[PDB]
Design a protein around this ligand. Structure first.
Ligand SMILES: CCCCCCCCCCCCCC(=O)SCCNC(=O)CCNC(=O)[C@H](O)C(C)(C)COP(=O)(O)OP(=O)(O)OC[C@H]1O[C@@H](n2cnc3c(N)ncnc32)[C@H](O)[C@@H]1OP(=O)(O)O
Ligand SMILES: Cc1nn(C)c(C)c1NS(=O)(=O)c1c(Cl)cc(-c2ccnc(N3CCNCC3)c2)cc1Cl
Length: 411
């Protein structure tokens, strides 16, 4: 049973998801005037707080909460340690709404207890291709096309309750208050991902990992030496050999992205993401924000030969705290972000991603099997992990799609 999720406008079961044939809202159309202006009620010893995600101290406060209380693996070996610079980048994109950054603090001494954050996204979330075909076959083209235009909605992330406050039904209250603040802004859908299975994803993909520093990954037990390698005299030497990379990129004309690259990168990215059922639409301002290099946060390279940009890739950094190991404090992970290839095969473009990430001291390259990420898995020696990222909408009925039909990278 789901005492909270059963009350919310999301599909309730997989069986229900199979009956969905058109994109559209779940709930009753409602107005901003219908939405309470007073904050959701909360216990008298707590209070709502809106941190300023551009202000160093407030960013540091939220950073500490997440550092100590955000996503861990099941064996409490690793915990995400999103940096302060990362949080300001993720949470303050163009036209962000400060009121969508929602915290709870203990009233007496202002102890920070919980967080949830929304950001705007312009999303294509109309009926997927395979379902539009079914609609044509049945003379239902019109209903299937009703919500084809890209929508201005909310992306939700960084939901976090302090370890001491777990299993007290605080997460639902955060979710209700975030919903209220978003609805007051006349937005009625959200998109979110989680590693856990909730009612009810519209897509799911496995995580994949590419070892860059296998000796450290084995040391911290992110990886082990696979059985097959025990037939060698030095299993770790062979493992290191297996994962060795060039020390400099191989593509002629690879360089870091510059502000002047924004229009070309926008063009080639938007052309590419069009091929997917669910994907973001990005303005120039949003391309600049999400793709221009930021030290320690996001790294973006373009292939420019003979004064023209033909390809690009981007990756972002999230270190994870290594909880139990004494010798290392962090696992430095690079995550595959947006990319587009027009001049070279995708594997040739992404090999340079691995090369750059390795040169910069990253330990592993991670991604979900979205976009065309499957197309380079084997050649570049990615392996599936035990994790899955599930993709959800709030208040949006959506036919189940494959993860290779998802083009929205979730941070
Ligand atoms: C229109 C605008 C709409 C805006 C809102 C869109 C919706 C956004 C929804 C949020 C998208 C977040 C995207 C991300 O950030 S995913 C990252 C989530 N964060 C973590 O995993 C950090 C570590 N864990 C925690 O901080 C806590 O365990 C959390 C906060 C996750 C739950 O705290 P706690 O463990 O103390 O439990 P509770 O007693 O307060 O509450 C129990 C209820 O919460 C349901 N639950 C558990 N985990 C999740 C989860 N990841 N998404 C949604 N719901 C979740 C659970 O099924 C149960 O409901 P029900 O099964 O009884 O029905
Ligand atoms: C290195 C490491 N550090 N940590 C903390 C872990 C769990 C690992 N192991 S992992 O790499 O193999 C991996 C990774 Cl990265 C991520 C998740 C996961 C779980 C829940 N949710 C998300 N969302 C990402 C998008 N925003 C919303 C939440 C990701 C699961 C695994 Cl299992």
């Amino acid at each position: 049973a789901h005492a909270f999720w059963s009350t919310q406008p999301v599909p309730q079961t997989e069986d229900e998801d199979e009956k969905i044939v058109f994109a559209g809202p779940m709930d009753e159309p409602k107005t901003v005037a219908d939405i309470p202006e007073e904050p959701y009620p909360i216990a008298s010893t707590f209070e709502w707080w809106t941190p300023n995600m551009e202000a160093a101290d407030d960013i540091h406060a939220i950073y500490e909460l997440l550092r100590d209380n955000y996503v861990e693996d099941d064996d409490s070996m690793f915990r995400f340690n999103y940096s302060e610079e990362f949080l300001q980048w993720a949470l303050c994109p163009p036209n962000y709404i400060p009121d969508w950054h929602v915290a709870v603090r203990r009233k007496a001494d202002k102890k920070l207890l919980a967080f949830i954050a929304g950001v705007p996204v312009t999303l294509r979330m109309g009926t997927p291709k395979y379902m539009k075909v079914k609609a044509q076959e049945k003379g239902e083209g019109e209903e299937a096309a009703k919500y084809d235009e890209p929508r201005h909605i909310c992306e939700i992330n960084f939901l976090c309750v302090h370890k001491q406050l777990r299993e007290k039904r605080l997460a639902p209250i955060l979710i209700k208050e975030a919903t209220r603040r978003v609805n007051r802004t006349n937005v009625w859908q959200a998109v979110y991902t989680a590693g856990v299975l909730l009612p009810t994803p519209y897509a799911s993909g496995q995580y994949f990992h590419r070892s860059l520093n296998p000796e450290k990954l084995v040391e911290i037990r992110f990886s082990g030496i696979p059985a097959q390698y025990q037939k060698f005299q030095n299993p770790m030497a062979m493992l290191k050999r297996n994962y060795q990379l060039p020390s400099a990129p191989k593509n002629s004309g690879l360089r870091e992205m510059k502000p002047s690259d924004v229009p070309q990168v926008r063009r080639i990215l938007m052309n590419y993401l069009d091929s997917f059922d669910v994907g973001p639409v990005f303005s120039d301002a949003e391309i600049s924000h999400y793709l221009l290099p930021r030290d320690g946060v996001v790294f973006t390279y373009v292939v420019e030969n003979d004064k023209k940009v033909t390809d690009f890739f981007s990756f972002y950094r999230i270190p994870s705290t290594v909880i139990g190991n004494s010798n290392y404090n962090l696992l430095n992970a690079a995550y595959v972000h947006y990319y587009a290839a027009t001049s070279i095969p995708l594997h040739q473009l992404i090999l340079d991603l691995l090369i750059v990430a390795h040169s910069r001291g990253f330990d592993v390259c991670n991604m979900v099997e979205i976009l065309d990420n499957r197309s380079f898995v084997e050649q570049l020696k990615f392996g599936a992990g035990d994790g899955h990222l599930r993709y959800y909408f709030y208040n949006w009925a959506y036919p189940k799609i494959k993860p290779s039909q998802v083009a929205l990278v979730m941070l």
